[PDB]
Design a protein around this ligand. Structure first.
Ligand SMILES: CCC(=O)Nc1nc(C)cs1
Ligand SMILES: CCC(=O)Nc1nc(C)cs1
Lengths: 200, 200
């Protein structure tokens, strides 16, 4: 009586719904600074994504936005540096430059803040040899200036204050706001909101 | 403009929907013998359950059915025996006897098949000292007979053939069929099936 292929198709539809809902919830937690909520939603989304073997262009964009935000959230934080041999912010830079999206003023701004902050977070943590290793992997007159700053442990140089962590976060949060509005009307959240508003 | 408490409430409604959907999908995979699908759905449900801090009586019953099926699936399979210091089937027996459900003929049948199979799976794996340790933790004249069988490595005794692994699995699958029918109409699966049927 039950068609296994049609049941599997229903599960793939629901998986797609859960992925969109979890991306919106991950975006909100990132915007709100709710770290534990972000960590729990990330774990849920990673597990749901594991239940999918074929993804559409839209779904690939959704999982790469989640991966990007995950690296950014881990920015100032071992096994990753053994698995990928790079820093979270360098990994975020790789995802950022490969997501199927427009390379507008905001994309270039976020990209440049990530490139500088990938060096600055190492200096903030006192690992200046790592800061030089990050610089060499990423990266004129300007390049020489940046290397001198790293070399002179000039963590609070006016350049790092302009291309700061807070500025990187504000620019990323601005991008997240577009994604948040784009997925604010997905099936799961739209149906869940209706239940809440009905109570009442 | 956005109420954080109402948004959090929508997320808790959706979490409840995802939990019910994932339990139904875990039940189907267990009934069908789709091990990799069961493992993926279990990982997804464990992650979603982590996003919930308050559970209703119905939701507690749902997570305990998932926990029970997980132990049963791990029945013939180290860290668990260091974390809980017991075997999966003994852990399943503990969940089974504490789920808020009726202790009918089927419940007693499944309970007794689990009690015997917890000893038999150790003998099947060649760990007869473990079989005696399991027997001592769980547990006349009958008890002496069972200890003699274990002691004489009589794995294929007529008793173990009547209280077999296959019989345990068939009785558990029979119980799963009631749960499967109970949750076959949950919001997520009902809405997902409608999408599939609309395409056709
Ligand atoms: C390496 C795989 C990975 O990072 N996956 C992630 N998916 C989400 C949803 C966050 S991180
Ligand atoms: C020990 C916790 C645990 O086993 N949780 C599980 N939840 C599911 C959904 C399967 S196993």
């Amino acid at each position: 009586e039950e068609d296994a292929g049609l049941v599997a198709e229903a599960e793939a539809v629901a998986a797609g719904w859960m992925l969109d809902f979890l991306c919106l919830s991950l975006c909100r937690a990132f915007r709100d600074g709710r770290s534990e909520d972000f960590r729990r939603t990330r774990n849920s989304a990673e597990a749901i994504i594991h239940g999918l073997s074929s993804l559409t262009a839209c779904q690939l964009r959704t999982i790469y936005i989640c991966q990007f935000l995950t690296r950014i959230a881990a920015g100032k934080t071992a096994q990753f540096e053994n698995d990928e041999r790079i820093t979270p912010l360098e990994s975020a830079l790789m995802i950022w430059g490969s997501i199927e999206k427009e390379h507008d003023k905001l994309h270039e701004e976020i990209q440049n803040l990530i490139k500088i902050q990938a060096i600055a977070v190492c200096m903030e943590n006192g690992n200046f040899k790592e800061a030089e290793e990050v610089f060499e992997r990423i990266f004129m007159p300007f390049k020489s200036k940046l290397l001198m700053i790293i070399s002179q442990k000039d963590t609070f140089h006016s350049f790092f204050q302009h291309f700061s962590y807070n500025h990187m976060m504000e620019k990323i949060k601005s991008y997240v706001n577009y994604v948040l509005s784009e997925k604010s009307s997905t099936f799961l959240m739209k149906a869940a909101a209706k239940v809440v508003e009905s109570k009442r």
